[PDB]
């Protein structure tokens, strides 16, 4: 029989949903070598060229679906026994630009997991490729040049007999796609960062070892007779001074046979190290289990009296530099029946309460 | 974060669902010659392979889901000026055996439509592959060698000026699939059957133009020393004597141009041609407008005194055969401004009420 | 394989096996029942075993 | 292992009803163990695709 065939349901413009076998649209194969180092890139493609030579089920729909609503689940089972572990990091940047830096510091702003082997089976995140809106589409990532970047922070502290495969598989699960938008407003009851705040190696052994990482985080990051940005945290440096409740978010890179435990806390560049008080501060105490890998240090109000700049001169030394630190401190020893050192990687996520004071000329460095 | 995989929605057996853009799984190109004959394979392959080399929504989800539970749709965009008409017919069939007849007779049974494009701008149909469950898959019909075929079974009364195509689009719809079994009940409601009654053509002209067709259906349709069979008309020849409602469907196949008024009755041989008092015995009238081009005559018991034979001897003539027949009766004159003759086809759907009578030995041989 | 109209069990490695030490990745299937289950017709016998 | 290994077994008798487990020819049954051994399955440490 004949029916009328402009009344059918063919322009049914529905987003993609239902069970997460319906909403796959891809899977992709990272090689992890036997003997990797950190600051690596395995995978570094623009996101729409995940999706070439796939025939899974939402692949087709992904393609054609002018408009999604939901988010792009993207989950990785990869694993390693617990004897070893390393750091890897996912990460997913909305543009390029010609002989890009693939630093970590760089990268991991924006939408990024970051995990490691030894410890967690999978780690699965969601995330909205377009950055300013609800919605987006295929044909909007593959000529806006989204970027998928993955690098491996932290090499392996013992190698696999073997290489190793990290399977992606990228799905689009049922949650709106909320922006995330950076804006002028002086009080903000909430800043994201993702800013590397960076990577604490302690070596295995006896000695007091002490890193500071300085809490006048705008201006950058080193490199040569240069410095690289992310857009967070050049946006914080808009603002001459600031304070707020920092939310900090410490992680495990090596395996859980390096055993350690770390005190953090807020203080001032003059504190030598071999000064043996530490713990008159106020502090945090920060022991990992063989499972566990996340820790979210907060360091509140109370903690800082005033604002303080966003950047310092470089050349400004520890004695007479009046912006508050953020300590690690060694709190026993570093300490293993297998040889490799005791990372960690600190990445303030975000300031809570944040109040941003003035309007920044500009300072031209990075380090303090 | 982590989660636990095991227990994720990754083994949803769902059926395809959604809507008619979302369970589409092939379009398939036909191509009808410009000087193309009856009985004239136009397309004839597997259903399987109408799927290869495929990208549609429902494509991928259609050869992986292990089971379905919902028909599929197949609906032809053929089109044609109502100057010109022929008439295709598409068709399912369980399967195969080497060196197969594509005669229409043959085909017909089971699943198909019928549609002349002159008249009708597109037709669909919905049916089952799998005849005797509620489910199916992929994989079976493409391991069972189901086997979709079209076929012209009347040419072009006018010729077009360049070659044609017809889209066939694949869908699943999600109607229940219901079987269709034949047994050996002696009573039933509806026996279907979809039996090509014979294609009649009538002449333009003047002359008294008569068509029998016998309702002794069993035995097959002729060939040269050999003959055809389906199985549902195989199946109602195990029966010696039957009777019930016959519902005939007739079509036509010729354009709207070759006009015609068709007087429908049930008689027996014995009647001459150029004997002209058919409209003493109870008839059905058929005029066909520009837009239609089926209507179902329906014959009722009072039309049968008593059963009759299923099979008759082939020696027997028209003079001793005392079963009746189907007579299709010029009323008029077949006219048009064009050249072409006045193609219709007759095809006995099924029979309802159904009685069956005896048990029959068999007579070998088709036409009376 | 390519005529075997009967379902398989597949058993696929979603990554990669691993580890600090050497040794295979040793995994062992039992089925332990059938729930539900209906049999059809009567076997004559085959003689064999793998497919 | 360093050295050689042992297995205690402890045999004992618990007061848990003896039911039994018995095959018949009905066609369809609700429950019909097996404990078939499907097979064990040997993965090569490395990155290739192993399917079974």
Partial sequence: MEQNLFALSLDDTSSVRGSLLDTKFAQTRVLLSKAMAGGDVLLDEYLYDVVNGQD?????????????????????????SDNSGCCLMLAINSGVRGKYSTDVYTICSQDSMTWNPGCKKNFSFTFNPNPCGDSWSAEMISRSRVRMTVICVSGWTLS??????????????????????????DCQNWLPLNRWMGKLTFPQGVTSEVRRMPLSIGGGAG?????????????????????????????????????????????????????????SFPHRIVQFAEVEEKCTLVFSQQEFVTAWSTQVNPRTTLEADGCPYLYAII?????????????LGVKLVGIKDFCGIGSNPGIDGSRL
């Fill in 160 to 185: 696999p007999t073997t290489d190793v495969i990290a399977k992606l598989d990228w799905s689009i699960v049922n949650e709106k796609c909320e922006p995330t938008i950076y804006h002028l407003a």
């Fill in 331 to 343: 709190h026993d020893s570093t300490t293993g029946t297998i040889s490799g050192d005791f990372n």
């Fill in 56 to 80: 899974f089920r939402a692949t087709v729909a992904f393609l054609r679906t002018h408009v999604i609503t939901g988010k792009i689940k993207v989950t990785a089972t990869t694993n390693i």
């Fill in 223 to 279: 490199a040569t007779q240069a410095f690289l940005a992310n857009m967070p945290n050049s946006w914080i440096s808009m603002w001459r001074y600031f304070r707020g409740e920092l939310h900090f978010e410490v992680t495990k890179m090596s395996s859980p046979y390096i055993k350690a435990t770390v005190t953090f806390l807020i203080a001032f560049g003059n504190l030598s190290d071999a000064f043996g008080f530490y713990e």
